Amino acid sequence: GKPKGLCTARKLKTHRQEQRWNDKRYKKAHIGTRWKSNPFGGASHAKGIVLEKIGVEAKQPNSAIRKCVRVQLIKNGKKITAFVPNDGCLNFVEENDEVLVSGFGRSGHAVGDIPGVRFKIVKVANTSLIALFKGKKERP
Amino acid sequence: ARLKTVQSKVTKSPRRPFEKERLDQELKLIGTFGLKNKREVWRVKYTLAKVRKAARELLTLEDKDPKRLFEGNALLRRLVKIGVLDETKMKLDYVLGLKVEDFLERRLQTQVFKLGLAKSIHHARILIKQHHIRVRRQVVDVPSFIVRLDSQKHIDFSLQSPYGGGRPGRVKRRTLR
Amino acid sequence: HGSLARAGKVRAQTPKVDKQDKKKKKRGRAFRRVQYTRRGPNSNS
Amino acid sequence: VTIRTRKVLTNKLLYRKQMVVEVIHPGRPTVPKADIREKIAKLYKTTPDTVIPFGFESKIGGGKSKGFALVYDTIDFAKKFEPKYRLVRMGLATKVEKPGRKQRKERKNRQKKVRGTAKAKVS
RNA sequence: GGUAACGGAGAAUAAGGGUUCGACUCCGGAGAGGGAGCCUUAGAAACGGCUACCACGUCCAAGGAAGGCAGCAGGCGCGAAACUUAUCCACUGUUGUAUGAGAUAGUGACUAAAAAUAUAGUUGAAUACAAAUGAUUCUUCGAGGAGAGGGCAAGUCUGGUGCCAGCAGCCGCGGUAAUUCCAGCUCUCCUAGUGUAUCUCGUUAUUGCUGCGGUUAAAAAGCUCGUAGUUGGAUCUAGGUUUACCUUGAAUAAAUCAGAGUGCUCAAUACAAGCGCUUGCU
RNA sequence: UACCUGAUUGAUUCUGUCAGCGCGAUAUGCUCAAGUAAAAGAUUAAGCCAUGCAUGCGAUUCAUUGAAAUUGCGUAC
């Protein structure tokens, strides 16, 4: 059982702090290497340069080739793989393009049947991918 | 230099976005009292919630507590003047009994059509918008304006509005010219 | 199977259809009034 | 056009009288300050140029409207205890044309670079 | 040692107990590219003061002479990320002509309140202002974003495609009869807003003091001795010297939060105002 | 308002997390009748800065009211 004495405040506080580190959320939010490990460095979006277009085989039981793109981030030069959402939108993305990349939705974890991809494309050539898909705007 | 400007929110979103019971109940409130959107009804829900919470917090205290006395009479006073509480029902145990309909009734929009100045509640609203009503010699253009008890019997057409004596509207003037 | 070269296949194949026209639906309070009077909603089958 | 004066106070240490003026102009536009001035002068049996209305804001839908007025004992006290812009507005004084702030500042800075009597010449 | 650390007043969330944050208008501290040294002074280790070195610039007729926007406005870089090289001392203040302090207008879907699309624009006046602008009084003419299997409100309608293209936060849809993709039509939610990404709080009794769990789901040290720490039996006036603790006061900046009053036309706000009759009272 | 719902199984009850759901901050997509208040180069680069401004006003008046200059005061707010 936990201590219950009237003069055990130090033990209770110190034990709580010691055991908070065994918590994934607390450790993930206070470890100290978060900025150097996260590709975005704690940001929500990041600009990058497209290096190549790749296809990722969907996980089972699904079958498809998800059209992803390899990007190098400008702010730190780290390489990531980002998903190009919507149908036939890989055509809009040319090699050596400036793309805005955002998280995929699950805070650094893969989403759906796409394995190992944690980012998606929001803008290409300073144009919204959704706008291009909907026909609102055209390629600069 | 310039200090922080004070702002407050008057609406709280429902915890569950989609429940048929709540959706139907709120759509009926929009129906009877002609309102514009769900924010209009959430505003009244929020004010009623504040009133009820204050009453409950006071009632936690005994009867003759100084704070209980002062705040309780103040709250009952305000409700009476708005016309939402019963002037015989002077107690917080009974202020913890009101509904959103009580407040929604005291809106200017409802009274405009209730007193016959307009046919439908939508008519009431578009009149209030087009500046055809006045209150105690004041042209009010806010359909949400609450009508105090004193103001209840001093609401008639604007002294200028073509339906209250004034230059004919655009349609009439076009026809005349 | 998928090849990375068939991107935008179905949207290209899709037959093109045009839209229609309708009177500007009532907006704001009027739409809510129409809703209240009208009151599954889309029971095609 | 019913002009009414309330909260009238006598300020001898400034030789005037301060009052809140309210005008009722149902249907009519906002009362011009000259018209208000004449009515207040008649009200206080005083010259129509020893009364200073100002700060007249108009309530909605016509009718009511409020402002302030200063009744002055005489024109010398008036154009002694008064900002220049008020007098210019009412014609008691005349505006003095002045160069803009930017150009005055630049001229001052340029003069700072010159010593002796050539400062007045430099421009 | 680390801090992606200026402290506080406070902010977000919020049964209660809390968790997180706080560069930022008020208070205190520190700095003026990095250090160091000093003149003047009541007050400075001042930088819109000087002196040197370091780094980096500017003008030279090559002998020399200079610079410090983390002030306002602008420019370049950096980035996901942030405004006009505009008008004035009329306002609050500085000892009061001077005040990029301060006040105005510009850009401004940060944001907060109130509201039009059914039953706005536009003309000349006044007003306002330091001049304006804009509102306020008069007068001329005169609807979009997500969705539609479940969670979760809403189609087993039609056409294309056949594990492809794609959708899908999660569970899952698609293999030639797809309510889930691409479209048309219809509906649903909210609505001048509505979605996406990262993060904080709730949800979460999944950090548990209130208040978790340890036979088998993660978790009792192989066992014992033992210092610090924590915790320690009953017992002194019932009847007929110290502490700890509790009660009540004192000392305890505003702004913010709660809250009293007060028709800014309501509200968010603001701190006002309300009465006679004029020389006014509260 | 002291609240939960979907997902491990042929089905069941648990542990448990993931996901949903409400608010707020920042960025951003699409879109925006008129108005009223109003934040706004903090985050990274206390990085670098073209150009304008941001600190000046009793005694001494042989200039033409008061210039110039010497004083004094302020520029430590």
Using a threshold of 3 CB pairs under 8 A, tell whether chains D and C touch: no
The residue type at C39: R
With residue A37 as reference, give the H or E element that holds it.
helix A34-37
Q: Is the CB of B6 under 7 A from strand E?
A: yes
Q: CA angle at residue A46 from A45 to A50, to 5 degrees?
A: 130
Nucleotide nearest the Cα atom of A35 (by C1'): E4
B166, C11, B81: which is closest to A91 by C-alpha?
A: C11
> What is the DSSP code string of chain D?
-EEEEEEEEEEGGGTEEEEEEEEEBSSS-PPPHHHHHHHHHHHTT--TTSEEEEEEEEPTTSB-EEEEEEEES-HHHHTTSS-HHHHHHHTSS-PPP---HHHHHHHHHHHHT--TTHHHH--
- Nearest-angstrom CA–CA distance, A118 and A46: 13
Q: Is the CB of B140 under 7 A from strand E?
A: yes
* Beta carbons within 10 angstroms of residue C43's beta carbon: 5
Contact D32, D65 (CB under 8 A): no
Residue at token pair 């065994």: A22
Contact D17, D50 (CB under 8 A): no
Q: CA angle at residue C27 from C26 to C30, to 5 degrees?
A: 65
* Structural tokens at position B60: 């936690």
Pairing of strands A79-83, A65-73: antiparallel
* Structural tokens at position D74: 């005489």
Is C7 within 8 Å of A54 when comparing Cβ atoms?
no
| C1’ E199 / CA C25, Å | 40
Contact A114, A128 (CB under 8 A): no
Identify whether A61 is preceded by a cis peptide bond (ω within 30 of 0).
yes
Is A53 within 8 Å of C8 when comparing Cβ atoms?
no
- DSSP-assigned letter for residue B5: P
Q: Which residue from B27, B36, B37 is facing C36, i.e. has the nearest CB?
A: B27
